[PDB]
Write a protein that binds this ligand. Structure first.
Ligand SMILES: [Cl-]
Ligand SMILES: [Cl-]
Ligand code: NI
Ligand code: NI
Ligand code: NI
Ligand code: NI
Ligand code: NI
Ligand code: NI
Ligand code: NI
Ligand code: NI
Ligand code: NI
Ligand code: NI
Ligand code: NI
Ligand code: NI
Lengths: 138, 136, 136, 138
């Protein structure tokens, strides 16, 4: 392990606004928040360049009684057995379901999976979260 | 004063990767890049959400062997039994875990809960997704 | 009459496997084996559970392309929003899915809910696990 | 597809008790219930002989604040990344957690995993459910 210390200059008003926000959110300090920003930036780049394995979640909401969304979802997912690990389903109300799908694999593959799921007519709301396997981070 | 100068300490591996990336992008120095990361962060954390009823997911990744993240995560979650429905956990490798927490409640409280989770020491990365179970 | 004779139809693949197994065990005929399976079933479904508060899991496996199991499963689950907390789903192969439903409520109602799920046409196999969140 | 029809003789009182039970449970008919029994019997045998892949779930309940059960559980599970697919956790009350682990792999391996998890001091209740990948059934 090796820690590298360096200085940076940030616009004063920007910094002031930043400190006010992270405190409200709950961060213990500015250094921790900035390191978090740097990790986030690196994770995003990981989804852009390379073929390294990434991980993510796809959250969707739908009415299971509407059309054939339920069948369509299953068929799409079973087509990607290698990337989809598992999914959590919560029955919101008599008609609405919330489902979150955990995926692991190549970035381009996962983004296509999200495209197909989110573009389904029955899917009302949805969002792909791009994150990491943590293997290459800390 | 227009600029405030201060120092920060970062693991070398993490800094090497950061330097490589910002060099490719064409940034002239670390301060420009971090300034931009800070601005984007402020913008994302300024958007209003309201107080309606929302259902969401909080995705997080961490090394379960680091500090006390595992204990902190549980204690924090067990404080909000009413909003936290369930959580899914996937063991990525020997040390890393990915967890997805499903929540429901008033947008205001959900956002606050997510902030505490995502800012816990030990959490390497994470994102909140809030949605209204209503119509598209 | 001591014995009641009746017929049943079974896919040949399933029957071949059954025949192979009971032959190894030393059963003389299919009726002896099925008689034993029926007796064990009655015994397991006669044990009392009470009416205390329990938390459980219902594990099921099915071919999502068979009949209307997927629709039936959802409709049935959405009728008991109060007892069903969440469900985990794992896509085993092109057709088969494994699902685990977490429930909480009065032992009596939980057992009844599990029975309806496990007896739905299309469900290949499944088991209920009830426990009291109390002390060992 | 081929259906084979055959007759069987069951003790009359046993059969009567059986019909009464399956109706109460919700089965549409005796044939369906018996085929279910046969599938169950085959699945159990699958866990006894062979090396064929099986699937199961391990349900446990524990107080996360008690001793080191939480850390012990994670360490054990991360030791079997190949068999454990994912897990669902529900916070029961301020102190008690309910967790269900989905596993897939060889029978002997999964039973050992259950042994280790269930034998933990902090685990108050628990049960391994032996089921199938469905691949070899219908
Ligand atoms: Cl400063
Ligand atoms: Cl008859
Ligand atoms: Ni299908
Ligand atoms: Ni649902
Ligand atoms: Ni992979
Ligand atoms: Ni606690
Ligand atoms: Ni883990
Ligand atoms: Ni942090
Ligand atoms: Ni419905
Ligand atoms: Ni599936
Ligand atoms: Ni059946
Ligand atoms: Ni560990
Ligand atoms: Ni818990
Ligand atoms: Ni395997």
């Amino acid at each position: 392990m090796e820690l590298i210390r360096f200085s940076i200059s940030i616009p004063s008003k920007l910094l002031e606004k930043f400190d006010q926000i992270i405190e409200e959110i709950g961060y213990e300090n500015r250094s921790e928040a900035i390191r978090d920003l740097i990790r986030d930036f690196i994770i995003r780049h990981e989804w852009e360049v390379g073929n390294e394995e990434v991980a993510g979640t796809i959250t969707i909401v739908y009415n299971h009684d509407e059309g054939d969304v339920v069948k369509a979802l299953l068929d799409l997912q079973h087509e990607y057995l290698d990337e989809i690990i598992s999914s959590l389903h919560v029955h919101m109300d008599e008609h609405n379901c919330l489902e979150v799908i955990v995926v692991k694999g190549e970035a381009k593959k996962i983004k296509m999976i999200a495209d197909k799921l989110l573009s389904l007519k029955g899917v009302k709301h949805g969002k792909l979260v791009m994150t990491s396997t943590g293997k290459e981070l800390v």
